[PDB]
Amino acid sequence: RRSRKNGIGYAIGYAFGAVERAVLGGSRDYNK
């Protein structure tokens, strides 16, 4: 019964997709 809520990759993937957009626009890096 414990499966249709825990989200195997629903929540985790949700935040993952955002982490990409962060670097997509402004590259996370700066030095010399």
Domain segments of the chain as ranges: 1-27
Mapped onto helix, strand or coil, the DSSP state of residue 31 is coil
Q: How far apart are alpha carbons 3 and 1 in whole angstroms?
A: 6
Which residue type occupies 17? G
Q: How far apart are alpha carbons 13 and 18 in whole angstroms?
A: 9
Largest alpha-carbon pair distance within the chain?
A: 54
Contact 19, 13 (CB under 8 A): no
Report in angstroms the alpha-carbon separations of 26 from 3, 7, 8, 15, 20.
Answer: 37, 30, 30, 17, 10
Q: How far apart are alpha carbons 22 and 19 in whole angstroms?
A: 5
- CB under 8 Å to 28, separation ≥6 — which residues? 22
Technique employed here was NMR
- The DSSP call for residue 18 is H
